[PDB]
Subunit: 498 residues, 4 copies
Amino acid sequence: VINYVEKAVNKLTLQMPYQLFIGGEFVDAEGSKTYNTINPTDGSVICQVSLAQVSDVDKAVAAAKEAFENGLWGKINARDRGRLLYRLADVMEQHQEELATIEALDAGAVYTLALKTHVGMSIQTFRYFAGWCDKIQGATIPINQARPNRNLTLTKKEPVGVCGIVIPWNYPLMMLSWKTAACLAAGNTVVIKPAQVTPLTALKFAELTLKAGIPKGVVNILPGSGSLVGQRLSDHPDVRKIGFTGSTEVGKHIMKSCALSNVKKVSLELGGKSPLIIFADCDLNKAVQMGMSSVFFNKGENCIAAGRLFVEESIHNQFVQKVVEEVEKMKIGNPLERDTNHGPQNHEAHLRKLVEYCQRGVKEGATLVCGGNQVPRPGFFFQPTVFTDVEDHMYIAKEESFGPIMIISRFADGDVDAVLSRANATEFGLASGVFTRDINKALYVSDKLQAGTVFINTYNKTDVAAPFGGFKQSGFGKDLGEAALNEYLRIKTVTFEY
Amino acid sequence: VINYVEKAVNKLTLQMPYQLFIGGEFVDAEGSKTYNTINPTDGSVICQVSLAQVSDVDKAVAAAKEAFENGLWGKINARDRGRLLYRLADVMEQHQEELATIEALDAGAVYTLALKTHVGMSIQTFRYFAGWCDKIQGATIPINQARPNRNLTLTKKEPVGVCGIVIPWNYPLMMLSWKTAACLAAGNTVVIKPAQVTPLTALKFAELTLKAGIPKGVVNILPGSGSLVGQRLSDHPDVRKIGFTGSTEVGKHIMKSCALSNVKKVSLELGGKSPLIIFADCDLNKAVQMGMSSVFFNKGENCIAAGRLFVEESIHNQFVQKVVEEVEKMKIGNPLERDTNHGPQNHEAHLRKLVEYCQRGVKEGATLVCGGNQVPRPGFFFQPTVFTDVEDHMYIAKEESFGPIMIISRFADGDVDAVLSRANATEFGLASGVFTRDINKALYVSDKLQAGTVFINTYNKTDVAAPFGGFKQSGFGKDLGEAALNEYLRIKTVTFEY
Amino acid sequence: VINYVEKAVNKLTLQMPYQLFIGGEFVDAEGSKTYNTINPTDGSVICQVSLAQVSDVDKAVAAAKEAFENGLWGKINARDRGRLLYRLADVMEQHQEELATIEALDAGAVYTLALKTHVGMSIQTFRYFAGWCDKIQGATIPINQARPNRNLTLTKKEPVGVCGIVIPWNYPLMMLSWKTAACLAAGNTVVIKPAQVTPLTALKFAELTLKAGIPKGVVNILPGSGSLVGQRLSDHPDVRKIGFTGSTEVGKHIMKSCALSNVKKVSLELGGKSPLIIFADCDLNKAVQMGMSSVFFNKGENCIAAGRLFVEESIHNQFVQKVVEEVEKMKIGNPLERDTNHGPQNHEAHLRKLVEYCQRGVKEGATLVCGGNQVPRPGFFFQPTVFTDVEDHMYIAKEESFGPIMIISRFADGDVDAVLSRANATEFGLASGVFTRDINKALYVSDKLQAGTVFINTYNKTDVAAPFGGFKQSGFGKDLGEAALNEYLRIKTVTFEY
Amino acid sequence: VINYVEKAVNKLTLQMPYQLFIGGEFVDAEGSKTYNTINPTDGSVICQVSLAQVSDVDKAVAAAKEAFENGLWGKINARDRGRLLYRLADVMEQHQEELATIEALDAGAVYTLALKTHVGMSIQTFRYFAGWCDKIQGATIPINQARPNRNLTLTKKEPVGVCGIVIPWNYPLMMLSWKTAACLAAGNTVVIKPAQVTPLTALKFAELTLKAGIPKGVVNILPGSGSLVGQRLSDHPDVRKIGFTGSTEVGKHIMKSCALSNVKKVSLELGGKSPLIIFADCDLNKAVQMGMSSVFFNKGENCIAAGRLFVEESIHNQFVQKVVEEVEKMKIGNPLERDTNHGPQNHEAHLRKLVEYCQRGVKEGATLVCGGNQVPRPGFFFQPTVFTDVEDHMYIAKEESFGPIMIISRFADGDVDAVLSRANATEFGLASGVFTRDINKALYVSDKLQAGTVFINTYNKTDVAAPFGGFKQSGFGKDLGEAALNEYLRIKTVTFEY
């Protein structure tokens, strides 16, 4: 029997676990320490959540180690591992409205969006990777023969072992699902650190692993302080791989701790300042719709959000006019209300940063066209924002906002290489986009953009089958697609002489 | 005109460059600083070699950056990049005797072995990867369609950019070739740091890149201090990937430096304590020949050398007797002499470490069966050595010697899981081996060994098509095979809506 | 509402469709023509089944064409095609006892075996291939660039279109599932011809496609005459691929008809005379168990059944003695009885051939150790049979029996190449096996056997992930594994200049 | 010494073998039967060439069988097979002017084109496939385990054995090279049937295989009658695969003969009626240049030649005007004249067909804009021809000309699906093209075109890495790219229990 926080909302009765999840059971942290998780729609405390301590991290790693080395997970067929992951996806689907409601409460995700994306894509992710389990294959290799004898060389793809994964707060369940599904599909066991500010869907997910019959200890979840849990996971002698998505400075530290302990494998996704280049020969009304999506989707809390729009001189003014017309139609409100287009920001500290960000944009001389302020209502709502006259040297041309702030620069009619240079000036390299009807411009621009993803006449079109990861200081390693599996596998070469 | 050290030796005239190689030219280091490279056959100074300074590292990176961003290498077809690498292999082949002679002088490699292995495998490496250039392919991926519109998603494999590679002293040209060939085949440019004690074949190789028409700046070579050059490469903001083979502590530091600078990609190969398990049902005379080679090949200076032999009780004494008989037949001497089959150790400090290693072995209670001492002749020759009665807690059971020291433990007749546990009780995981005629034992043992390579009824059977790399604290990433390319490529996802 | 033949049997109420299945509905054949399907346990008529006419074949092809060109199947996402195929597998699982009972009645499959293998593997097949749908990927290829312009070349994997598949009678549902799952996973639509003698599980399967929500016309099933339906499918101008498993002479005709109509693609699996080589150093009791299985599994109605056993001289007599002891323990009986382990042969005409086969074996001088005759009881039961003193020139050493007839030859101690030559002296090449504890012999023999599958220390170990198909006159093309998909896809190369 | 026909021409002394090439030697056919090969520039007899008889075909197959089963080719490492194929490419390059001259003489190939394409691409082909030899890899597959036992399942890629390949007359050496390189790279041996009308570069190639050190019998070449040699190869019990490029009716027969003999594997490329769709938003002058090349390249003797041009209504008349202007500038003449743009047709009978083809086009109502006749001058020259007012029901809208005949239809301004329907209304499916600056049209059209290759804003852009083959009645199987290898390999599944 699990302890829950019960809540009647959205025509459901939510039952929310709030404790650490270690070895198939929900347990208090050492000293029964807790912290408050805050609802961004009104600033209220949702509930108290267990605050994982170093001893709890050790317990979680030990449970994952045992599950991997001696438990059922390490013994069953790849095909049967796949069956369990497909069952997990089914259980998630059965609980989809509840999960989407929890995400609306915990992260401010608009419910309709949380259903379709935060939860919907999570279910797709588990189903996709479940299909990979019995399709992960090694090789047989035609090596030179040690005549008069013969040789056979093969490779075996094997799991890496116990993994630690650190999940950001922008799409809590979805980002958890991306990493967890690939990790588990490859035969590993895992200790998951959800963001301090967004523990709840991870903990509901933990309960669903029980319902799906995932062996105890395969999944362990440790809400609490990022510095505490992330550091101990990265230092731990029994952890063999860390997957991290978060801030550049924390990621650098994570990688350093991986090095200095046991040279564990690491993948890093460290956000971006992603350019979207909009040419005068695009479909303009479509460019307005997709340009707005590129920035405002999920209240801008989106690692691949377009952090700069470069718009060709001849359509610039009309583009901005149309964006403003459409921004005015956005319905700001409670994420549980069906007419809501734009939900609150995730947490208060982030709201405060967005306010300071726009103050600085104005200070340094950009033109504030609309927004830039906290919406006058309870909770942590921020007005969709449009800046123009942004120059390359400006802070807002360089720094990632992680909010609903469209940052527009002009470029001269016909100036392809020049605008590419400005778009590529960043040390980030996560995503990018180009809008043009011209096939030659589209293909050339996609070649030249220094980013892990290039969108052409679309934006935010991720897919569980399409690898996602950054270049340069956005990190390395892929989530999603076949490529994600390689981060969670090791290759053993076996060479016979006969 | 290039400055050479000229030497008439081994029926040829050596012409050895001795300077830094930057942007297609041989140049003195800052301040014309140099150091002596020493011949391990007689302790003599071969010549003075340029000692790279920080400003020289920066010049080399700048040359590699320019070659990659603006030079011919980044413009030519993949097929034509292949042609240049195949031409390079041809040039190396035309100079095979010269290269093998330089390796014999600089590293103490027995000339006949250097010709077949150090040089022969290097030529195979370049030819193999040359063939990959126009066969590196991305994907087209069946993503969900944004109906009523359509989507196309593809991936492009692109070069990572400027790479830094740090090469160990065990097989100087060969380890250089492993990394450089995969790096260049993927379309990157490179700055190479050969071991301080073994610069000469790297510098001759550099000259050969001119003969082959590799564009200026694609290959840059910086002999000197490992701390200086390796540190600056790992710190440098324009370097995007480091490939490192060397000691665990240096490797950990390299990875830390990659993290704290610009989160550049890193691969590590950090040596091993590789177990070889010899069952009573093996072919015993063959086990003696292969077991000896597993330890003594290339005077033990071999990252995959068997660092422990576990020998089944019932054959142990006969195995040791046969080894001793064969060790006595070994011809120790000048590596240029055709009868020689055991060359000198690479450098004096390493010889002194081997002497101390065997002293510790004796002090802690292992039985010194034969060897253990410096051979009383000029140079740095060490006796092929056999220890028995080695227990798991012993220093020599845990520490990598990197010398010709066979370290034998018994295991009980019929035990399999017990000996596997002992074999796996290292934090290393580079290689391993098993000798048995029993198919069931062979397959089970290969499954259970926690190592990147498992040899069955052979040892030291590497092949340019077969990936090589470690698990656990031996590091991560592969050299050789198709898999090596992935360390030197990035994947760009391009997603269209139409 | 669907017309059923209802039967109370095996503690179930079977509801069996008996009509053609065209465009999502069960319909009578032209002129309401029918034929009788026969229960091999007692020779009784189970029911009348529709007898497809040429006009019915055309209707089925027209339905499949419309479903492919204009229906939902050609429009939905690959991932959603996968979902439908998973759902189909789930529906099959929900009906597993009913399907297995139908197969016992129609094919004489022992119920316990039909549940685990005939039906169980069919469910695995659909789940496996469902997982492939969104993981079928094309390439991006680094072609030479038409400078000063650029080129992009990609490939797109596309469905082939309307396929005809002809299914044998030995494992009716299972063989249907092998081909249908790969065909549908690749996005094609299909017209299925089940063997005239085994229509019933195919027709129940058709009903289950309705339950699973497979769009109308995607699956069409035409029971009746093989010559009529097979010929028209192979002749039809709108069919683009035929997949055929059956007799050599029928297969050759099918391929000829594919050629002379519209050069439609074809795959063929034409049976085997598969050798099993048993060495004196094998585990003898295990060799007896697996050698028994190799011949007697599914009453020998198994395309990969071992059609010759070569047994090393020194163990031959003991092997035969042990086989006879095990054969004597086999319980022959009604497939629905739980203690039955040998069911009746599939149909009367086959039983007659088996009788003639053993008459000829005796005529030509083989030693009949046991069996060789129809069991005195109603239905079409054949006594498990063992022949020894079989010489290479004999009919029974060359011709496939497809029945429970073990055909044993000796080979001299220490011969390996000699026995291989004899094992390879067939024009068939479907499967083979070797029993030995010697790793060197196992690997050498597996290299040298001229067969599409080689079993080592096992037999009959098929798996939905492991490709199955023959060499030489056994045909070409694979069922199962990733490889099977290639038979049902085409590759389009798209090359841009920009 | 080899017997040569010697000719002083093009600054060279050509030495042309003219005999059958069997088991490494040039030999007369049975009865010393010969036929004349004719120079299309002047109608003169070049020389007499051996006329292969059935006994000669059997001798060739026997030599290939011995070379495969017992000779060095089947024993050497894959890497060393690669080295030999690279060496062959080097030898071809050393003889490139001689080969191009022979092709000018025998096929009427314009010398400058023969150097760059006919010979140049042949050299690229051998170098490309040489690189594949040691990169052809099988798989290790995670099958369900027979607990408490374990299973290992792997695949081996193996050669198919003796192959027969039938080569067309349009690019004699190049088409030979496409097939032969992939065949040999996969480890097979081959009997090659060059077109009766174009034997000479095949026979010179045979001599070059001697110079390259290809083992005797690996390559055999049988000039003579296509019906005789092709029929016997397709019937032969020791041939395991036929690769055929040629006419539909002959291809159908070849496939029938493969079926009725030993169900040998077959690939077919049977020509095309390839549509090129030119939209008004294309770059018009470039469309004229590329549209002309799509038809007139290699005097139209090109299986992927655009056989219909659909030109959008608003640009049709200007397009036609520009084409006529450029056609008038084409230099028609001797292939050895360095300013020749348009050489003679391959042989007289083809010239006569082209004359009749154009008479039929005019008779049925198409408008002859220019050309349509033999050029009055010695040899077999045909005028570059342009037809307009071509309607979908016309013979010239359906039949492949294989000559320099541009066949133009208008399509309606702003229409896309209607023109696609018309372009797809052939039973051929080899190639296709689209010219448009609109990325959306380009991507949609490339999806919808029912052809094996789609060119976008280019034409005739084949590449040795890019697979080439048809759909529908154009055949099946690919030449070029990794995909070509699969036609020449078989897959063996090996499954162990341990």
